[PDB]
Amino acid sequence: MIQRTPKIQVYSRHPAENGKSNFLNCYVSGFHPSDIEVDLLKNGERIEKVEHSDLSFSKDWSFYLLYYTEFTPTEKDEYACRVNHVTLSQPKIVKWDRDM
Amino acid sequence: ELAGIGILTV
Amino acid sequence: IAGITQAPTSQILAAGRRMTLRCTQDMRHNAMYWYRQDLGLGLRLIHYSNTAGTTGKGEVPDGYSVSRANTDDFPLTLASAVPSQTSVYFCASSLSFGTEAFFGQGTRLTVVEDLNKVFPPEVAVFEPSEAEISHTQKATLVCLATGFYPDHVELSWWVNGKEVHSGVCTDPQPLKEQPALNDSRYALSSRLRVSATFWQDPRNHFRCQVQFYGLSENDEWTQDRAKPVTQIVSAEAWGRAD
Amino acid sequence: KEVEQNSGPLSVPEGAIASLNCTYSDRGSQSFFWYRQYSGKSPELIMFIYSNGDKEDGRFTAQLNKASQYVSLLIRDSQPSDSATYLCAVNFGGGKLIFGQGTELSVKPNIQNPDPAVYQLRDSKSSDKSVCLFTDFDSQTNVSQSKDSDVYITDKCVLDMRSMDFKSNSAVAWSNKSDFACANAFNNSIIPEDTFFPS
Amino acid sequence: GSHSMRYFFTSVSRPGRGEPRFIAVGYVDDTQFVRFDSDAASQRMEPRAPWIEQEGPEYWDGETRKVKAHSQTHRVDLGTLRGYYNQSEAGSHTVQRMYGCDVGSDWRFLRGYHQYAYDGKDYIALKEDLRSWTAADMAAQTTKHKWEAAHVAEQLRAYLEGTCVEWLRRYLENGKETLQRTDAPKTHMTHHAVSDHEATLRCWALSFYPAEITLTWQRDGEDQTQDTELVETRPAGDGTFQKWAAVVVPSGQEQRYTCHVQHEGLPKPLTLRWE
Structure with a gap:
């Protein structure tokens, strides 16, 4: 069996600008097996309306997915990605950094 | 277009 | 040697009956198929199956059930026996989808509404001409299968008790006796030729025989003649110096 | 859908060249088949063709022109035993293997x-x-x-x-x-x- | 310049039970155009790009049947591979298929491939000549013997040099507005102090297509192999792509460092330095 922990990044579709609407992305890649749970959070609480890409893979066979939702960044709001995979003891949280 | 030949059980 | 068999090879159904055509295959093929063939419009896909466990619908699945429990078997079953389903039926198979298909033996099926119009053939051997022998030095016996329904017949010639495949020809399709009426009775003709040396020798036997595929022995029968089952009706001729 | 064959019955005398064509409706069909069928018999395969162009087998030439949606079988040097109805088969999907109406050949002696x-x-x-x-x-x-x-x-x-x-x-x-x-x-x-x- | 068409397939046995999860996706270049999902409502091949919608009923019936056929082949496969590796029925397993073709700048056939995996390690793969197989392990040699006698390579070569190539051209001509576009990367640089004497310069490239890009760092005109963070090229989700590259710089010496962006939508390679 080959099993691989997902790489995770959180980011926006467009340069984040306060009061302007955008898309919050969570890109999970490099994982095997394909089953994975990905939430998006807004101040710790789950965001309901989240869509995702159709499952595909890379040349080393590890899968990738893009999880996304429409959002509007303010300066007082924290956004994150929550990711669950069989290779984790408990879910992994990566915070959104606009100022990358 | 998908393959309409060459796809066989292992 | 790995092949494909169908069962049965011929069947006469009553209207509104149920009939399962078996088809089996040793060749470890994934994909299997059912076809109907009719006198004008060629082969026509009924059902398919790409792998064991799975099925699919073709051009004319209406009236036809199909099942794929295992790799080997693909039985076609007809729930209600409509008169439209009279055809020749062909099972087939290919190693995977889209590859070369290998066909079964074929199945002649005729659904009749009235069993009281099913007849065995009347067979006659017409001994050759005097004038043919003096012109050509060859002699032609003709045969005549007449008065039969349906066209489920196979004709063969036998010399001394041995079947022949040279000097013989039979009509391609059978011929309707009254070529207009519903469920009309058919006629088949065939010619055997040998020389006057083989013919005028008195110690030569000639037999024309018709294998008619009739009703099953499990069938309803009530009426005036004998039960028109599967039979060989033969007709004989001997050699003559006259 | 439609597979139309060269409308029979054809009559080509002995020793000559017989020619049958096949047209199909699906631009994306990928496998193509020629069958021979005698009187009250099973179809048996003459040839399969997958790629565009000419395939050679003895007295038989397969020709495939996918842009034109065209398959053909050229029978050289035809014997009386070549007399049968000829069948063209084009695959339309997975198991949607669909046939022509049949072209009847009689090579006359x-x-x-x-x-x-x-x-x-x-x-x-x-x-x-x-x-x-x-x-x-x-x-x-x-x-x-x-x-x-x-x-x-x-x-x-x-x-x-x-x-x-x-x-x-x-x-x-x-x-x-x-x-x-x-x-x-x-x-x-x-x-x-x-x-x-x-x- | 050069293009590609690619089809990707995943079947997951969910078992002690059965009924596997099947998902199929097709790409032209870095753009998805079709999908199948066994979980989805329609049980059809579905459009995922505007230019594929103009295809007729023959195409959608033909792709649905061929994709449904791939799925049921993979279901038998999952049954078989359990047997070849003596695995029980309690656990979940995965098969993966990838096939497709590359073309050069003249749209002539360049190279084809057809590869197969089981449980995320290579199983069997078609070699570049398209007439022979690389089998990874001993169970795959059995599959290789089946596929050699069945002429699987012959059939595959016919698809990969003909049908793959000829349909890729058709897709590239029907959607030449979308597929023959190159969005140049839109580039900026940000600066962040981590301590009182060191600083991170991050070079950005945003909204580009295709995904192939090269970001490189250079201290005084020489390639910075060393302290270079460089992320995975990520999608924006609108069709385009993003990527950054970062380095750590001793402070007040930031102007010694140049960022270099090569991408095919650019007239010339780009040189950002901070300021």
């Missing part, structure tokens, strides 16, 4: 002695029942059947005496209990000019 004649044969079932035989004519002669529902005339059939190396074209006609003339039977569509009626 060179009759070495065109000596046409009409005979009347007596039965073995008594010696009173009459029947007519029209035999030994050349392959240009064809047959019609209609005067009434009385005179049943069968089609042109070809036998072969292999040992004596001789071919024979023949047809049978009869009409039960009548004043059935054996001379006045076969001339609906007109008989050969010197047909022997030795009465």
Whole structure:
């Protein structure tokens, strides 16, 4: 069996600008097996309306997915990605950094 | 277009 | 040697009956198929199956059930026996989808509404001409299968008790006796030729025989003649110096 | 959907080149098949073709032109045993393997002695029942059947005496209990000019 | 310049039970155009790009059947591979298929491939000549013997040099507005102090297509192999792509460092330095 922990990044579709609407992305890649749970959070609480890409893979066979939702960044709001995979003891949280 | 030949059980 | 068999090879159904055509295959093929063939419009896909466990619908699945429990078997079953389903039926198979298909033996099926119009053939051997022998030095016996329904017949010639495949020809399709009426009775003709040396020798036997595929022995029968089952009706001729 | 074949019946004399075409409706079809079928028999494969262009097998050439949606089978040097209905098969999906309507080929023999004649044969079932035989004519002669529902005339059939190396074209006609003339039977569509009626 | 068409397939046995999860996706270049999902409502091949919608009923019936056929082949496969590796029925397993073709700048056939995996390690793969197989392990040699006698390579070569290539051209001509576009990367640089004497310069490239890009760092005109963070090229989700590259710089010496962006939508290679 080959099993691989997902790489995770959180980011926006467009340069984040306060009061302007955008898309919050969570890109999970490099994982095997394909089953994975990905939430998006807004101040710790789950965001309901989240869509995702159709499952595909890379040349080393590890899968990738893009999880996304429409959002509007303010300066007082924290956004994150929550990711669950069989290779984790408990879910992994990566915070959104606009100022990358 | 998908393959309409060459796809066989292992 | 790995092949494909169908069962049965011929069947006469009553209207509104149920009939399962078996088809089996040793060749470890994934994909299997059912076809109907009719006198004008060629082969026509009924059902398919790409792998064991799975099925699919073709051009004319209406009236036809199909099942794929295992790799080997693909039985076609007809729930209600409509008169439209009279055809020749062909099972087939290919190693995977889209590859070369290998066909079964074929199945002649005729659904009749009235069993009281099913007849065995009347067979006659017409001994050759005097004038043919003096012109050509060859002699032609003709045969005549007449008065039969349906066209489920196979004709063969036998010399001394041995079947022949040279000097013989039979009509391609059978011929309707009254070529207009519903469920009309058919006629088949065939010619055997040998020389006057083989013919005028008195110690030569000639037999024309018709294998008619009739009703099953499990069938309803009530009426005036004998039960028109599967039979060989033969007709004989001997050699003559006259 | 549609697979249309070159509309039969074709009639190509012996030793020549026969040619059958096949058109199909699906631009994305990927496998193509030629079958031969004798009278009351199974189809058996002549060739498969996958790629565009020409495939060679003996006396048989497969030709595939996918842009034109065209398959063809060219039969060189045709024998009397090549006479069958020819079947084209195009695969349309997974198991959607779909067939043409069939093109009937009859390779007609060179009759070495065109000596046409009409005979009347007596039965073995008594010696009173009459029947007519029209035999030994050349392959240009064809047959019609209609005067009434009385005179049943069968089609042109070809036998072969292999040992004596001789071919024979023949047809049978009869009409039960009548004043059935054996001379006045076969001339609906007109008989050969010197047909022997030795009465 | 050069293009590609690619089809990707995943079947997951969910078992002690059965009924596997099947998902199929097709790409032209870096753009998805079709999908199948066994979980989805329609049980059809579905459009995922505007230019594929103009295809007729023959195409959608033909792709649905061929994708449904791939799925049921993979279901038998999952049954078989359990047997070849003596694995029980309690656990979940995965098969993966990838096939497709590359073309050069003239749209002539460049190279084809057809590869197969089981449980995320290579199983069997078609070699570049398209007439022979690389089998990874001993169970895959059995599959190789089946596929050699069945002429699987012949059939595959016919698809990969003909049908793959000829349909890729058709897709590239029907959607030449979308597929023959190159969005140049839109580039900026940000600066962040981590301590009182060191600083991170991050070079950005945003909204580009296709995904192939090269970001490189250079201290005084020489390639910075060393302290270079460089992320995975990520999608924006609108069809385009993003990527950054970062380095740590001793402070007040930031102008010694140049960022270099090569991408095919650019007239010339780009040189950002901070300021």
